[PDB]
PDB file of C-alpha atoms in Angstrom:
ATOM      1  CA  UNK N  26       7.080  -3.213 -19.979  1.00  0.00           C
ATOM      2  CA  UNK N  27       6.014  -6.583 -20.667  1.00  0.00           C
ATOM      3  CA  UNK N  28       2.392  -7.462 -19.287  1.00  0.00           C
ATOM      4  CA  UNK N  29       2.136 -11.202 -21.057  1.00  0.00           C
ATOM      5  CA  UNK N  30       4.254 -13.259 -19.995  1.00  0.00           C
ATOM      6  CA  UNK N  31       4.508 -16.455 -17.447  1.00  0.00           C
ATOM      7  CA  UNK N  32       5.764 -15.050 -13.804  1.00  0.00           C
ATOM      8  CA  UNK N  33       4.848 -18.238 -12.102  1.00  0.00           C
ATOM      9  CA  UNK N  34       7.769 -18.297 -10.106  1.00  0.00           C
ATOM     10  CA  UNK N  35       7.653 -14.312  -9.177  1.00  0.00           C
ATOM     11  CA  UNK N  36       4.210 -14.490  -8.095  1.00  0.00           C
ATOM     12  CA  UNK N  37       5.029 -17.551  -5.488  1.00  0.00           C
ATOM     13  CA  UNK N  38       7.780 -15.721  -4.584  1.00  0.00           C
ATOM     14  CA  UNK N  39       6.331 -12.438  -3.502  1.00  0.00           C
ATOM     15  CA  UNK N  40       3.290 -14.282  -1.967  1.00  0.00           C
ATOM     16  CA  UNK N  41       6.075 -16.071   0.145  1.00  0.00           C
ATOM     17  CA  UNK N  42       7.265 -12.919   1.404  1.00  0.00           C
ATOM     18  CA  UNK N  43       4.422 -11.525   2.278  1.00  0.00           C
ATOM     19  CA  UNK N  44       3.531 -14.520   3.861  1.00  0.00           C
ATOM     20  CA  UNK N  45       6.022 -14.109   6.598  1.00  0.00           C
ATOM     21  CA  UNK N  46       3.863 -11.463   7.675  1.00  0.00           C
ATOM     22  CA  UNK N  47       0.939 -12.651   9.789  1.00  0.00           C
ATOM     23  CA  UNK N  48       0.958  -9.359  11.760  1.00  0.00           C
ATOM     24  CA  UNK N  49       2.961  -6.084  10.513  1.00  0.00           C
ATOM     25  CA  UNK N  50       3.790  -2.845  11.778  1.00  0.00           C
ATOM     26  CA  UNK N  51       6.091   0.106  10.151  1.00  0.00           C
ATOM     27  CA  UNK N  52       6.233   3.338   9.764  1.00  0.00           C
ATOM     28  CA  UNK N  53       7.160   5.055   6.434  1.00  0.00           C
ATOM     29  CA  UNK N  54       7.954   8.149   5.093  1.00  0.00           C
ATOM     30  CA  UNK N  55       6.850   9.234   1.480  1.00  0.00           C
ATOM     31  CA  UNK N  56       7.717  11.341  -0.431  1.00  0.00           C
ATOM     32  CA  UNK N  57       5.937  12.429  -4.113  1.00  0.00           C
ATOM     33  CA  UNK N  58       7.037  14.552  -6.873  1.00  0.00           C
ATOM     34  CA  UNK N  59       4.078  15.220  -9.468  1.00  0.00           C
ATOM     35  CA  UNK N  60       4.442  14.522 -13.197  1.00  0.00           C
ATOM     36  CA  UNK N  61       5.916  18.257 -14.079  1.00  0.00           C
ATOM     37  CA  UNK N  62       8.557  17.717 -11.425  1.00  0.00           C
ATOM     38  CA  UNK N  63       7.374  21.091  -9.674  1.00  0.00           C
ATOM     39  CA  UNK N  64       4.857  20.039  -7.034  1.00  0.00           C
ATOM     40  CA  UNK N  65       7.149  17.831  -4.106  1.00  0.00           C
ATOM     41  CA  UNK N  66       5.224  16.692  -0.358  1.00  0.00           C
ATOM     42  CA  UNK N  67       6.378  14.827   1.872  1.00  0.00           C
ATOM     43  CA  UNK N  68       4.243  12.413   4.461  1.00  0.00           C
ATOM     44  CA  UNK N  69       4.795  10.180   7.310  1.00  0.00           C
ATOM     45  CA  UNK N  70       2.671   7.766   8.899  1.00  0.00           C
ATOM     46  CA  UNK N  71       2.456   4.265  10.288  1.00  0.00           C
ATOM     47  CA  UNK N  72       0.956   0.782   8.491  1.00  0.00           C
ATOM     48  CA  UNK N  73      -0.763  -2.266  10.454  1.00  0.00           C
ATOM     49  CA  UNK N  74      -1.432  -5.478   8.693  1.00  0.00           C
ATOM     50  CA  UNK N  75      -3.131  -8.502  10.545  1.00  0.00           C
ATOM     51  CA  UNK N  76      -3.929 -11.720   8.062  1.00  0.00           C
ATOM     52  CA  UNK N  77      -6.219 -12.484   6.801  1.00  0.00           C
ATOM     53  CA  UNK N  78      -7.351  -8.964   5.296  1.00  0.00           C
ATOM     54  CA  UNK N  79      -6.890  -6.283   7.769  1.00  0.00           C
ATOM     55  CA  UNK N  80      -4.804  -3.410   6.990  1.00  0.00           C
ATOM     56  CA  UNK N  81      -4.258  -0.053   8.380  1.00  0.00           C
ATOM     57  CA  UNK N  82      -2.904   3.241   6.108  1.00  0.00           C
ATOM     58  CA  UNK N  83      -2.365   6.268   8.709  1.00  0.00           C
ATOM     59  CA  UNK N  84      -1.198   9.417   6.876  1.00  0.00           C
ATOM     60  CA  UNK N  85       0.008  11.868   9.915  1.00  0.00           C
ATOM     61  CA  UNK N  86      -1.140  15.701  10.299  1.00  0.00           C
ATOM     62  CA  UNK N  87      -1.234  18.273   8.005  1.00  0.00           C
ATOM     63  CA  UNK N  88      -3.596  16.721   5.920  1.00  0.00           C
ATOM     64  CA  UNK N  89      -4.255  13.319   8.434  1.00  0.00           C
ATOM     65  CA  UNK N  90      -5.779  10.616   6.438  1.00  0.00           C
ATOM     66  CA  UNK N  91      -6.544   6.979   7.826  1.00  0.00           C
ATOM     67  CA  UNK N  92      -7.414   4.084   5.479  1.00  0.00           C
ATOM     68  CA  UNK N  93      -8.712   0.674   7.052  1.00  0.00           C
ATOM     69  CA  UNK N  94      -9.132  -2.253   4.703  1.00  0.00           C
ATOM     70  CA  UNK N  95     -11.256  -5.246   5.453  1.00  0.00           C
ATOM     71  CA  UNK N  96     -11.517  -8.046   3.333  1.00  0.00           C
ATOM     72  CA  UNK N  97     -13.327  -6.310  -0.091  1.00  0.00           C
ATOM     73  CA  UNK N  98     -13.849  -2.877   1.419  1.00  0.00           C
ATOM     74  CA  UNK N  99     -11.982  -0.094   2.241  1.00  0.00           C
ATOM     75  CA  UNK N 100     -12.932   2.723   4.356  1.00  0.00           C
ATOM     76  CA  UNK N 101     -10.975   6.172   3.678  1.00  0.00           C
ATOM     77  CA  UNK N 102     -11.126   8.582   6.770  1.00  0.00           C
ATOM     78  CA  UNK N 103     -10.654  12.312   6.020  1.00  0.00           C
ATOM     79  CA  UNK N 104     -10.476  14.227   9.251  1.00  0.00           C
ATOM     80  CA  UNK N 105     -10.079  17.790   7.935  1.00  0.00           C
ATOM     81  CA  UNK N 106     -13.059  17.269   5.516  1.00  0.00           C
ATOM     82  CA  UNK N 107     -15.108  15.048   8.245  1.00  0.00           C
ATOM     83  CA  UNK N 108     -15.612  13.013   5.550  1.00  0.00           C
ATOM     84  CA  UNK N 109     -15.692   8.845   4.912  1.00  0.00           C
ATOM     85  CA  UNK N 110     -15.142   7.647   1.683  1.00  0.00           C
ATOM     86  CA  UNK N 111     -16.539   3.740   1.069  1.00  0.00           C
ATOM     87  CA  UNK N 112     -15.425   1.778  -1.639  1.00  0.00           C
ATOM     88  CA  UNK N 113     -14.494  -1.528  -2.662  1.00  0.00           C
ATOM     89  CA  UNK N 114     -10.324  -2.499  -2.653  1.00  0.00           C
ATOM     90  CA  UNK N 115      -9.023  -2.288  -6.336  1.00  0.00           C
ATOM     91  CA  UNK N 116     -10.447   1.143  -6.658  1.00  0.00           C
ATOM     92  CA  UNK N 117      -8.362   2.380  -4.023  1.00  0.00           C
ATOM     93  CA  UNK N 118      -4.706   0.239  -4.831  1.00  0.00           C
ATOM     94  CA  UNK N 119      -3.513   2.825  -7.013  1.00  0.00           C
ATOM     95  CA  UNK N 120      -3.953   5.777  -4.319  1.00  0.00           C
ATOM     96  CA  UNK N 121      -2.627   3.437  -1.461  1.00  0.00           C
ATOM     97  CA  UNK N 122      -0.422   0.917  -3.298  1.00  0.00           C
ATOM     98  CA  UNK N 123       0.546   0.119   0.032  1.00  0.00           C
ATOM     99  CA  UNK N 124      -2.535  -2.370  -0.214  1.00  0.00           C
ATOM    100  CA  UNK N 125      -0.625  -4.857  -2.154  1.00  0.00           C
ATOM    101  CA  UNK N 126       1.020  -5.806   1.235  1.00  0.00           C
ATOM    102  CA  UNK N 127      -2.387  -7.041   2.371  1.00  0.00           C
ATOM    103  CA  UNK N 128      -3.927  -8.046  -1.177  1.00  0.00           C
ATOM    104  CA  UNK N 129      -4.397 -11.401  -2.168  1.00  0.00           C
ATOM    105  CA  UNK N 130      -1.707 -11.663  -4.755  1.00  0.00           C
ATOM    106  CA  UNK N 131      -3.782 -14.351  -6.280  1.00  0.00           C
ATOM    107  CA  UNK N 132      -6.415 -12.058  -7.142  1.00  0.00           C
ATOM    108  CA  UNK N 133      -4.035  -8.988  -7.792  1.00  0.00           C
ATOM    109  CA  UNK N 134      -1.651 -11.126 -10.243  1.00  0.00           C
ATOM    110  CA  UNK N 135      -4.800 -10.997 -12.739  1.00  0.00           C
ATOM    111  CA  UNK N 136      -4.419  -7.182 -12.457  1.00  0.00           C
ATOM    112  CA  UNK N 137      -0.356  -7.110 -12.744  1.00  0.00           C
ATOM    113  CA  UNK N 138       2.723  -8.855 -14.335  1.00  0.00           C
ATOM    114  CA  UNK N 139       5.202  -9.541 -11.919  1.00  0.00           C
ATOM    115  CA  UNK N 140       8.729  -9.585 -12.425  1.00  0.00           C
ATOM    116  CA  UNK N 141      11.581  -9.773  -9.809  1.00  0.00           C
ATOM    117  CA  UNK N 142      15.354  -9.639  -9.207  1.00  0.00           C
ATOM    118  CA  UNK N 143      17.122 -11.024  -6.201  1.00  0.00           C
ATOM    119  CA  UNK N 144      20.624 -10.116  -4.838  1.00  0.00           C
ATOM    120  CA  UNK N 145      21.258 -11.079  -1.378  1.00  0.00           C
ATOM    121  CA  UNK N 146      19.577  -9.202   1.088  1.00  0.00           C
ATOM    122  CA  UNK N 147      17.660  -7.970  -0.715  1.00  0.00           C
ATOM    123  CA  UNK N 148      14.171  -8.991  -3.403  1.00  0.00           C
ATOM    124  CA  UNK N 149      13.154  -6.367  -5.280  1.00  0.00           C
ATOM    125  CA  UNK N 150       9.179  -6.812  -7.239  1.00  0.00           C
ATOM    126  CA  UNK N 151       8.532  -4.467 -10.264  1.00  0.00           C
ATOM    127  CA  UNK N 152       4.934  -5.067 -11.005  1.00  0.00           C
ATOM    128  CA  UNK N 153       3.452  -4.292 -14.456  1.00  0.00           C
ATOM    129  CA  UNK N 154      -0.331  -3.207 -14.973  1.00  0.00           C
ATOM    130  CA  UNK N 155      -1.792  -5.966 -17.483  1.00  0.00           C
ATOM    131  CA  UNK N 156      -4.422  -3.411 -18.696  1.00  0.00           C
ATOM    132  CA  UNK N 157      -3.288  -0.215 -19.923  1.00  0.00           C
ATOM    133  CA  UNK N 158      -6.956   0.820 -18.524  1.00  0.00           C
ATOM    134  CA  UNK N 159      -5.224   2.363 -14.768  1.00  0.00           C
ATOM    135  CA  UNK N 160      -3.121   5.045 -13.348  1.00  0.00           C
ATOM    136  CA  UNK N 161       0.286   3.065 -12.883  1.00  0.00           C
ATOM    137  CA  UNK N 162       3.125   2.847 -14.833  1.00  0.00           C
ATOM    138  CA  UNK N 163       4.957   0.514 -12.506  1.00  0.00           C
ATOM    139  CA  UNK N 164       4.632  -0.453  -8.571  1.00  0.00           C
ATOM    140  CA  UNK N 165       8.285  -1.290  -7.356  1.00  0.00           C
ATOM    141  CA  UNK N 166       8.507  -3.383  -4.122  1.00  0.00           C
ATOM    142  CA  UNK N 167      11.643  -4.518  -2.388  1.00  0.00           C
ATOM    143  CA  UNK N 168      12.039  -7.062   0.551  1.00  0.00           C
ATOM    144  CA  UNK N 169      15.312  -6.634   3.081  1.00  0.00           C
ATOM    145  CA  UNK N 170      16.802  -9.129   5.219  1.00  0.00           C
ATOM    146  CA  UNK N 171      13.136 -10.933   4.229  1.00  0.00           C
ATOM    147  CA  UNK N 172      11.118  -7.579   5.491  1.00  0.00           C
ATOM    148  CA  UNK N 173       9.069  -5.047   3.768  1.00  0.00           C
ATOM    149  CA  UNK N 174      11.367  -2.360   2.564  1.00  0.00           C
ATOM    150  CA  UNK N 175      10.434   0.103  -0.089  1.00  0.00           C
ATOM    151  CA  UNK N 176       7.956   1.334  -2.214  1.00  0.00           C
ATOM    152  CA  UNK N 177       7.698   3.208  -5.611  1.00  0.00           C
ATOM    153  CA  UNK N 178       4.743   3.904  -8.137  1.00  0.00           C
ATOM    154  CA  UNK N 179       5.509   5.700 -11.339  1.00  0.00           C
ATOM    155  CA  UNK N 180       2.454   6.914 -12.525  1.00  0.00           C
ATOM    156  CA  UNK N 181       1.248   7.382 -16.202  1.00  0.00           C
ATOM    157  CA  UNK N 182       1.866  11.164 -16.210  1.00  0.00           C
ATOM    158  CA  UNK N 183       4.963  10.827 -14.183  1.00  0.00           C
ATOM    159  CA  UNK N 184       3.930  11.231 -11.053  1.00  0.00           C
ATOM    160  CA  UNK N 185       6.782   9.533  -8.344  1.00  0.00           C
ATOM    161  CA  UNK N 186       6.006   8.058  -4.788  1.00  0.00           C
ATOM    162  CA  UNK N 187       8.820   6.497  -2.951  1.00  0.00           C
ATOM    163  CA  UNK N 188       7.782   5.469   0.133  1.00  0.00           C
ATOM    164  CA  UNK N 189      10.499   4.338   2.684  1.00  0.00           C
ATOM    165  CA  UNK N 190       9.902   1.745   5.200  1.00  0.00           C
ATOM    166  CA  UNK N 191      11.407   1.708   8.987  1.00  0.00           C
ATOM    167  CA  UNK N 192      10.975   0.171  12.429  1.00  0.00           C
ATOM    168  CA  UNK N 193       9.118  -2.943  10.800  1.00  0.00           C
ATOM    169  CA  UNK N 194       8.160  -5.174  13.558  1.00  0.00           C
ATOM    170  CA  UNK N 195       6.732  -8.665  12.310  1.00  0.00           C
ATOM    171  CA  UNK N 196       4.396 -11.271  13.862  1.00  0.00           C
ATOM    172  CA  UNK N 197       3.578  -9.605  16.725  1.00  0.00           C
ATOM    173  CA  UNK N 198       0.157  -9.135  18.859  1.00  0.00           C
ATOM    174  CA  UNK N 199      -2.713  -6.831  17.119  1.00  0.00           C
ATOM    175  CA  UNK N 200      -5.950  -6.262  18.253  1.00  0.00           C
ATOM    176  CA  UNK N 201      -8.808  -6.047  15.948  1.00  0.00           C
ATOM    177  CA  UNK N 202      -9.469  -2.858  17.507  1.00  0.00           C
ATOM    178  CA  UNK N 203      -6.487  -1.581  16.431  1.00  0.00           C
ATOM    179  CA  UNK N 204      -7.855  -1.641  13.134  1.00  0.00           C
ATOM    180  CA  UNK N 205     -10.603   1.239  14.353  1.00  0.00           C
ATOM    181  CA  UNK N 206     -11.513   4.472  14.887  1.00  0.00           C
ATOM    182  CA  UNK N 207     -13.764   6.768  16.277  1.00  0.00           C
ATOM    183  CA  UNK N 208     -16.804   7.684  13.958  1.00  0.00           C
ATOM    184  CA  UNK N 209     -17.651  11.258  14.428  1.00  0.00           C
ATOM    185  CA  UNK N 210     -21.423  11.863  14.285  1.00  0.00           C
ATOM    186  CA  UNK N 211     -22.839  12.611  11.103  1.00  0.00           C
ATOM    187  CA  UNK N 212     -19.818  12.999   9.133  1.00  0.00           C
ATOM    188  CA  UNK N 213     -19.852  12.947   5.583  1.00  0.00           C
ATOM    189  CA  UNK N 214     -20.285   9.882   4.031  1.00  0.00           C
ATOM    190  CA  UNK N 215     -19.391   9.222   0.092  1.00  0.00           C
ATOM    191  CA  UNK N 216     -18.615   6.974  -2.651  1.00  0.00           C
ATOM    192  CA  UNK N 217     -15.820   8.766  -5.100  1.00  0.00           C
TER     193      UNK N 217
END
């Protein structure tokens, strides 16, 4: 629970990680359970990630929603709605946490204690909001075998997203274009 303190080492050691990482793919499944513990969906989609700053967030069908990040933007692609929603990064982090994979943890470590415990195989990151201004409790990331793993945001009301990793391939080839998508004319375009 503790937001002051001196993670030094943690910080290097996450950015490390992530590091390894030029070029990601995965795909994940999530699943959230709202605060009252009465309201469970699951989703499945797929995650790109090509340094420095790209970063792709597909959400599959019902409900299809594709996030691209670039650099200090994010663009948030609703296809139901035919909507786009345009906003700067650390808006967007605590609906797509999934962004830390991309952030610069330089810049995000000003936003978040970082604490972590290592056994083996496996690193696992529990990182702390240092403003009690936000919507996160805690953001829980774990490395295997040196990979992306697992995901899971606690939210201040209770709300819990575990999101499970699999099929993470590292380092190889991604096009920029693979970081794009079709633009349907005149679709809805928005800022909140």
């Amino acid at each position: 629970g503790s937001i002051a303190i001196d993670d030094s080492a943690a910080v290097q050691r996450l950015t490390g990680l992530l590091n390894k990482a030029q070029t990601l793919t995965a795909r994940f499944s999530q699943l959230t359970l709202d605060g009252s513990g009465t309201r469970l969906q699951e989703t499945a989609g797929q995650l790109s990630l090509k340094r420095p700053g790209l970063f792709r967030w597909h959400t599959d069908a019902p409900n299809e929603q594709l996030l691209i990040s670039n650099g200090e933007k994010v663009w948030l692609y609703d296809p139901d709605l035919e909507q786009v929603t345009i906003q700067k990064l650390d808006q967007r982090l605590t609906q797509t946490p999934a962004l830390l994979l991309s952030g610069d943890i330089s810049k995000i470590s000003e936003s978040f204690a970082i604490t972590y415990k290592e056994g083996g195989n496996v690193v696992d990151f529990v990182l702390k909001p240092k403003t009690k201004d936000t919507l996160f409790d805690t953001l829980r990331l774990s490395f295997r075998s040196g990979k992306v793993n697992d995901m899971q945001m606690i939210d201040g009301v209770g709300q819990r997203t575990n999101i499970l990793f699999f099929d993470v391939k590292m380092n190889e080839a991604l096009d920029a274009k693979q970081f794009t998508f079709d633009v349907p004319p005149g679709v809805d375009v928005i800022q909140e």
